[PDB]
Every structure is written in C-alpha cells, then in structure tokens.
Amino acid sequence: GMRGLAVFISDIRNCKSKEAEIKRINKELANIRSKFKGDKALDGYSKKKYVCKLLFIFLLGHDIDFGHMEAVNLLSSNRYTEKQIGYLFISVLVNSNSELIRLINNAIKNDLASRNPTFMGLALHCIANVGSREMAEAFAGEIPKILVAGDTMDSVKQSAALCLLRLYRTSPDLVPMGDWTSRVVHLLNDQHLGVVTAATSLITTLAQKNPEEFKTSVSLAVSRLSRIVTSASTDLQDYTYYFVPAPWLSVKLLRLLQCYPPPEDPAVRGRLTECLETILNKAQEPPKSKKVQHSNAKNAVLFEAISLIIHHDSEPNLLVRACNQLGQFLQHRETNLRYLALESMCTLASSEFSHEAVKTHIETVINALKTERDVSVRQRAVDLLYAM
Amino acid sequence: XXXXXXXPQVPLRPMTYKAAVDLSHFLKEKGGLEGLIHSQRRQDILDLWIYHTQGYFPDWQNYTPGPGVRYPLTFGWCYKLVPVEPDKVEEANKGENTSLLHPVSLHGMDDPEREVLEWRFDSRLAFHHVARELHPEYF
Amino acid sequence: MIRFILIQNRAGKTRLAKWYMQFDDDEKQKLIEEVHAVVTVRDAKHTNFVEFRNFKIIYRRYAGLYFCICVDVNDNNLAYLEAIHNFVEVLNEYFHNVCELDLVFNFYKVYTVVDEMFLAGEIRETSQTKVLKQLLMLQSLE
C-alpha cells in the first residue's frame, strides 16, 4: 500500500489537542501545495498518495482549496488504484467549476467507452454518487444502452441499473420511457440475482410514474418470487443468508408488487397467493437457526408480504391469517417485533373486511399499554386503539 | 478456557438431573465458562460439542426471560446468565482496536431484552430449581 | 430509498458518511449532530428504529461504532436492520477481524465496500461471496 499516507494518519491520531492537529494538517497542506506547483512532474504513486491525504484532511472537516486538477489527472491513469482515488475525490468534493466538469465528463466518457468492466464501474458509480444535473445531461442517453445491452457484464449491469435510477430521480425529464423498457423488464429473469436485485429497484421507481409501461414485470416477479421462497439452500448457496433465501430480493419483489393491483392473469394470481401462503407458513415452522440474523431475515420478508396482502385487500383468507400472525407478535419478547406488528395491524384496521378481526386484540393492546416500557411502542399502541 | 477447546459421533443420551450436574462440573473442571460473555454463536458452539461428544440433544440449555439473571430450565445445570452492568460494558468497549463482532461488542443483540450477559456458576442451582419457582408456567 | 448512511463512533467522530440525497453542509452538520444525539442516549430497552418527521433511522451498535441507515418512512425496517449486519460481516471478512481503527486507516477502501453493497440510495449486492470475491479481485489490480 502507501506508507506515506499511513504515517500521516498516525500523526493525526498521535496529536494530543485540536490545535496540534491543525498545525500538523496545515503543514501537510503546504507540503503538498509545494509539490503540485512543483518543478517535478509527479509519479503515479505519489500523486495518488497525496490526493488521498488531501481527502483525509477533507473528511477531517478542514476545507480543501486545491487538488481537484490532480484528481482529474488520476482519472486518466490506467492503473486501477490511481483511478479509484481520483474518482473518489471528485465524488466527495464536487465543483461547480465548469472547466473541471468538462474534464471530468471526458474522463468518464473514456471509461465507459473502454471495455474494461472495472473502469466502467468506477465511471458508473461516480455518476451515481455525484448525480449532478450536468452529469445527467451528459449520460442519461448513454446509460440505458449499457444496461440493456446483452454482452454487458453482470456487475456493470447492476451499477448501470442503479445509476440510471439516480438519473431518473434527479432529472426525470431526460429519462423518457423507450425501448430499453422492455428489455429491462426481462432483466428480472437474469441468472445473476445481483442483477435482478438492482433491476427491481429501477423498475419499482419507474412503475410509480408510469405503471402501464411495466405491467409485464408483475408476471415475471411473481414467478421469481415463488421460485425463491421454495428454493433449497444448495441451489442458491451464494444468496442464502442464514438459511433464508435472498431475503432482500424477496422484499424488493414484494414491494414492486405493491405498485400494482392483483395480477390480471388468474394463473399468476394463483401462483402469487400460494406464494404468500407459503411465506406465512414458514413463519410458524420450527426455526432452522437460533440466531437473530435468521429471524430478522426471515421476518423482513414476512412483514413485506403482509404489507402486500393488506395493500391488495384482495384475499380474505390471507387477510385473516395476516391478522393472526400480527396478533401473535404482540406477545413477542422482542421490542422490535411488537412495534412493527402494532404498525401493520394499524393499517390492517382500515380494511373493511378485516376490521372485526383486528378488534379481537383490543385487550392485548391495552394490556401492553399498561406494561410497555418503550415510549415509541406505546404510541403505536395508542394509535391502534383509535383505529378501532 | 473451554470455549477455546470447543472452538452424532456419539449415541443419544437423555438429560437428567445427574446428567446436568455432572455436565456442569465437567465444564468447570475443564476450566472456563465462568465469567465468559454470552453470545448465541458461542452457546451454539457449546451445545453442539456437548451434543456430538456426549449425545445430549441441544434442546436442554434454556433460560428464563430477562431482564435480570436468567435461570436454567434444566435442573442440575449450575450455570446462570447474569447481566453485565452498563459501566462495565462501556469500559470494555473502550478503544478503537476492539473487534466489531466480538461478543461484548454486540451489546446483547442476541438477547431479546438486549442485555449483555455473562455466565456465572451457582452451587445453589443443583439444590434449588429456581426456574420452576419463578416460572411454573414453563413447567 | 436510503437518504444517507452513517458510521459514527460513540465519541461522535464520523468514520463514514454516504449521502444519497442533496444536502448543504449546514444541513449535513445539523444531521450528523442530530443523529448522534438520538442513538447515544437511546438504550437497549429501545427498538432499533428511530422515527423522524420525514425520515426513519435504522441503527445498530457494534463496539464503539453506531451504524445508521436513514430511510423513507415506507421502507422496510427489518430489512435494513439486517442489511447493516450483512455489511458489517462483509467488512469483517474483508479486513480480517475488523475494528474501528481499520475503518480509519483504510478509509478509501471502505468507500469501495459500501458502493458494492449500496448504490443510489438502494441496496445493490447482498451476497457476501460475490462482494468478497470482487473485493479480492480488485486488491490484485495495480
């Protein structure tokens, strides 16, 4: 690694007072400024090392008045470490300065053009992190092409999907629905779950403004969701978290489903309901692991599924089961779960069909009101009472 | 300590008062457990070793709910979990070199009542089944 | 979405900060201070979530460090709670027995890690295997 950087950090730690820290820092700033406006052209390592030191100083809370140019020079470097530090730097310290912006944008352009996936991910992330309007203007057109193209690497695909999301959030106008939309939906079918995870976020946000374009996703997601929950540990070894299969992708697909009403094709609607029934069953099954990570992963999916059930207000039997599980959670020893159950049930109360089922637990709630130490939970319980 | 020693092969055996009492002492003699910070992973490691070597199915080691001292359900198990005082937890977590995932650093995430707990040995537990007295419901 | 990720020690020094939304420095500083106030005072007794008018905080404490993810109110509380651990565990594997000091000396590397796991105010990669593999690959590179 870079020894000189390590030493400068140790020196800062070793400082006994705020003042000593300032003195050491100003010394470094001057030493560095000396090198940059220095006769010697700097080797790749030192330029990378010094720019790193400047960043540390910035993070320390001291403003930095220079070093932006050097960072751009590092962007050109073909060495990854040099390129990563530079891109980090312009990401943290963003300039309104136009001269810099044109230089940066050219640097990014070169990287996206380069077939190396690592450079592409640096460039892609940079756009996402900065997410500037100026930056959007430059690449809003280009990014979907990268995302949608086959032959694009998975990792590039992941960042590509999320990067476009940033562009769409920042500058919705520059991102119009087009033909990339169809291909993006089928990205939900990708073998690599990391891609699917990223794609689903893009889709969920897009579907909110323009639902009609992406209803095809509904059918696709329901199929993957069902497959994932029934999935065995050996089949998804990489994405199984404490014996829970893809908890986060499952959550995300359920939230996507919440954008739409129940699926138009009954076959799909059946597959979905059986899936939700399964999820609810798994809750009551004896736990594979005693560890809390298992429960949190498992329950996070459940609470999202319950959220979908409540949203649709579609299936009575499910609404009934949902009410039941939440009621069981009111008694749970973990403060976290009781809080969440009280919240969800509170929403559930609004459903006309389920209203009477919720009123069953009024005593349980009141009992909590007498014994509950947590102030936040007490509010979510008082809130439930008014709901009934 | 024995946690280092631990860190199917044998036939199944029932958990009995004699089994639990002998087991308690067997662990004490091998050094360890007393004073040790509780984490679910640790107990899982412990439960398994007892299970593989000595054939006791890992269901026996359960404790009363918190907060406060957690008492063993199995009679003749002489180890109770007691909460560490807050000031003691903080002093232990002082410093920038303490591991993020060390049991003291977890701050009782494994515990529903979120209390940091340590094993302590009690002679009395062999003679008095404190768990039954406190929570007959469980019995 | 995730409005911002915060890694803060008990003292109040900021080990990491990722902003997925626009904030001016006056706002950020108010936020950093505001977040520190809530978590240090808040105990075990309390839930892992803290509720803001506009935002929600999911936070967990490891050693001297508070890991805080700030999200919109509709976002999944439990999911992000465990996302934090998934993140810590990746960090653990990466630095080999990770500690706060590691986060200071290798600060430029922690950004790399966060970006693999979170991007654009969203969850990116949730597989420890793949994040770690990628992280290893990059080490080899010059």
Numbering used by the authors:
A (entry chain B): 9 to 396
B (entry chain C): 55 to 61, 72 to 203
C (entry chain D): 1 to 142
Quote the paper.
At the cellular level, Nef has been ascribed multiple functions, of which the best characterized and most critical for pathogenesis is the downregulation of CD4 from the surface of infected cells. Myristoylation allows recruitment of Nef from the cytosol to the inner leaflet of the plasma membrane while the loop engages the clathrin-associated adaptor protein 2 (AP-2) complex. AP-2 is a heterotetramer composed of α, β2, μ2 and σ2 subunits. Nef has been shown to bind to the α–σ2 ‘hemicomplex’.
To elucidate the structural basis for this interaction, we have solved the crystal structure at 2.9 Å resolution of Nef (residues 54–203) in complex with the α (residues 1–396) and σ2 (full-length) subunits of AP-2. Nef buries 1170 Å2 in this interface, of which two-thirds is buried against σ2 and the remainder against α. The Leu164-Leu165 pair of the dileucine motif anchors the loop in a pocket on σ2 just as seen for a dileucine peptide bound to the unlatched AP-2 tetramer. Nef Glu160 of the motif binds to basic residues on both σ2 and α. The whole turn-rich section of the loop from 171–179 is anchored internally by a hydrogen bond between Nef Asp174 and the main-chain amide of Gln104, and by a partially buried salt bridge between Nef Asp175 of the loop and Nef Arg134 of the core β sheet.
